[PDB]
């Protein structure tokens, strides 16, 4: 749903190691990243399928 999909990926300040997916706007595709468990932002989806389904 686009505004979410332009935000830069963010780990946040917490120190857990959760693999998440974010949409990358230059490359037009969901890429994986590591999320720390708190904070961060909306470009943070649990799967590739759900990420491309929102932003692709």
């Amino acid at each position: 749903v686009r505004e979410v999909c332009s935000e830069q990926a963010e780990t946040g300040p917490c120190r857990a190691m959760i693999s998440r997916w974010y949409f990358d706007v230059t490359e037009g595709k969901c890429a994986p990243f590591f999320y720390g468990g708190c904070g961060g932002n909306r470009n943070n989806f649990d799967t590739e399928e759900y990420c491309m389904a929102v932003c692709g």
């Binding site: 780990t11 300040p13 917490c14 120190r15 857990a16 190691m17 959760i18 693999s19 590591f34 720390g36 468990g37 708190c38």
Partner: protein
């Protein structure tokens, strides 16, 4: 752990790995059936792995137990990270021995200048990702509350304490949350948050466990 050393095997026998398919947070064994960790490490299926040294090789020493109850503190605040602590009740008691043991809860709140040992399998680089196979260790001090407040102005509550080096170069990192900070043989802190990993003037802040000893004790009792 950025800037630490590999722990001698089975020297941190109370260190556990919380696992859901992959390692995502650490924890501490405080008796045969309960594990303490950070509340932001909540998931609904958690498997606790005890006796681990190399997290990617079956070594023969390990015990794998599923989490039967996960209880976060009632006042955990997901925005400020105030009261970031949770208890896990294992489905069965573990078998205690040379490489799987308990750590003592605090007798009192350790003063500034105490040396602590922080351990974990979290990322080892400040820029980039490198997940160690083997448990890392770090010797660091508790900072004066003032230094801690001055580094994170307005965001430190009475339930938080900072450990580290204001010069940067060493510090816990992603994958280390929930892990033990033991000072003088007592569990004084739980790895929680910081900005970046090992960046100057951004030390590690931990949940101050000495403020929760009656909560832990009463929660074990009630269930």
């Amino acid at each position: 752990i950025v800037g630490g050393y590999t722990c001698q095997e089975n020297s941190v026998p109370y260190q556990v790995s919380l696992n859901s398919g992959y390692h995502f947070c650490g924890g501490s064994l405080i008796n045969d059936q309960w594990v303490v960790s950070a509340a932001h490490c909540y998931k609904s299926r958690i498997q606790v792995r005890l006796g681990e040294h190399n997290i990617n090789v079956l070594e023969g020493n390990e015990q794998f137990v599923n989490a039967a109850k996960i209880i976060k503190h009632p006042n955990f605040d997901r925005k400020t990270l105030n009261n970031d602590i949770m208890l896990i009740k294992l489905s069965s008691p573990v078998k205690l021995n040379a490489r799987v043991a308990t750590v003592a809860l605090p007798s009192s709140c350790a003063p500034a200048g105490t040396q602590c040992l922080i351990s974990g399998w979290g990322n080892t680089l400040s820029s980039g990702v490198n997940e160690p196979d083997l448990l890392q260790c770090l010797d660091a001090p508790l900072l004066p509350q003032a230094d801690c407040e001055a580094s994170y102005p307005g965001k430190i509550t009475d339930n938080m304490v900072c450990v580290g080096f204001l010069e940067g170069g060493k510090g816990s990192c992603q994958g280390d949350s929930g892990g033990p900070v033991v000072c003088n043989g007592e569990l004084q802190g739980i790895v929680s948050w910081g900005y970046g990993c090992a960046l100057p003037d951004n030390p590690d802040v931990y949940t101050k466990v000495c403020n929760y000893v009656d909560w832990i004790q009463d929660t074990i009792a009630a269930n």
